[PDB]
Design a protein around this ligand. Structure first.
Ligand SMILES: O=P([O-])(O)O
Ligand SMILES: O=P([O-])(O)O
Ligand SMILES: O=P([O-])(O)O
Ligand SMILES: O=P([O-])(O)O
Ligand SMILES: O=P([O-])(O)O
Ligand SMILES: O=P([O-])(O)O
Ligand SMILES: O=P([O-])(O)O
Length: 346
């Protein structure tokens, strides 16, 4: 895959790819397997999400999942007989192979260093940058021949102490992304590299009201040393039911939002390939405003020439947004799907 001069994703053939995507969680958690396999058959659940119109999937994972003898949990083996005995690595192998056989694009995502919380930086007190890079190379090495695997989202949701272009090696996400980029492309040179934003930054940023991995402002001062034809920018953005930012409370709302989205990520759409790695919310099951907010975001995305991204999420059991499926793991939120098809232009 690559990025052409029109900021479009093209495949090996040279045809434009459109990512009608959604996030599928589980592999980055204590269970070390995609969620819902207590309620559903994994193959049938994939079949369903393609049928709704999705052709792309973002797969969070964690280091533990990639280890040889890590066992999965919460799997109902009555509904999932062909996973019995398999290690979580072998289940990941089998899931990526299934997406591939169905012709569904897969963006792998290094979500958490410890199968729990999301780290501020690319390293912790028990997970070094060396381990981080090695794990990226491991994944790239393993799946580099799986045609429909798109590439790698280097690290999920940088925030807190993370900075960009300050000259401080311990916190500069931009430089860490360059090193992650180099590692992945050395092994899988046809993979795309997805890079997320940070939050508040001491330089080249108007701060405040920023979501994790949501600020790309410092890119204007400090370009990424990542090949133009591989770099995919993938910030996150959420609405009122994730956090009540002050601007949500504004009387102007939601007319005030486009300037804020423009500032945080939007202004880069015209010169960089860009999509949202995560966006979503309860869509009226949670608030009056989240309906309005999601509608406005789609309207703004369409206007910036953006008709792709990865909705958050497939799974219901995401605190604070819900998903495409309801809590019965079978019923589909039709209004959420109508919103996405609007975004996709379908
Ligand atoms: O596929 P390339 O020509 O962008 O490297
Ligand atoms: O198999 P890994 O997680 O040690 O790279
Ligand atoms: O049912 P399969 O995927 O194990 O052949
Ligand atoms: O992963 P945490 O829960 O220790 O932050
Ligand atoms: O298992 P790792 O994270 O040390 O590669
Ligand atoms: O000092 P650095 O962050 O530019 O390496
Ligand atoms: O770095 P930009 O300003 O050319 O997008």
């Amino acid at each position: 895959y690559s990025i052409n001069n029109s900021r479009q994703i093209v495949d090996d053939s040279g045809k434009v790819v459109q990512l009608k995507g959604v996030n599928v969680f589980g592999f980055e958690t204590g269970n070390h397997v995609m969620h819902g396999l207590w309620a559903r058959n994994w193959k049938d659940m994939i079949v369903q999400m393609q049928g709704l119109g999705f052709n792309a999937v973002r797969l969070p994972f964690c280091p533990a999942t990639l280890r040889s003898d890590t066992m999965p949990a919460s799997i109902d083996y009555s509904r999932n007989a062909d996973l019995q005995g398999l290690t979580s690595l072998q289940i990941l192998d089998k899931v990526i192979a299934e997406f591939n056989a169905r012709g569904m694009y897969v963006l792998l995502d290094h979500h958490t260093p410890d199968c729990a919380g999301i780290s501020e930086l690319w390293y912790t007190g028990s997970y070094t940058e060396a381990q981080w890079l090695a794990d990226l190379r491991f994944v790239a090495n393993r799946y580099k021949n799986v045609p429909y695997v798109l590439g790698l989202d280097l690290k999920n949701e940088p925030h807190g102490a993370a900075t960009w272009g300050t000259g401080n090696a311990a916190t500069d996400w931009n430089k860490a992304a360059e090193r992650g980029s180099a590692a992945v492309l050395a092994v899988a040179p046809k993979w795309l590299i997805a890079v997320e934003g940070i939050t508040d930054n001491p330089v080249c940023s108007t701060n405040g009201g920023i979501f994790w991995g949501g600020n790309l402002q410092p890119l204007a001062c400090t370009p990424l040393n990542i090949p133009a034809n591989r770099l995919l920018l993938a910030p996150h953005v959420y609405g009122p039911d994730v956090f009540v930012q002050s601007y949500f409370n504004d009387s102007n709302f939601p007319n005030n939002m486009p300037a804020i989205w423009e500032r945080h990520f939007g202004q880069f759409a015209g010169t960089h390939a860009l999509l949202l790695g995560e966006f979503g919310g309860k869509y009226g099951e949670g608030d009056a405003r989240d309906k309005t907010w999601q509608d406005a975001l789609v309207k703004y995305l369409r206007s910036k020439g953006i008709n792709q991204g990865f909705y958050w999420s497939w799974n219901p059991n995401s605190g604070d947004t819900g998903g495409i499926l309801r809590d019965d793991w079978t019923s589909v939120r039709q209004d959420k799907m109508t919103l996405l098809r609007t975004l996709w232009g379908t």
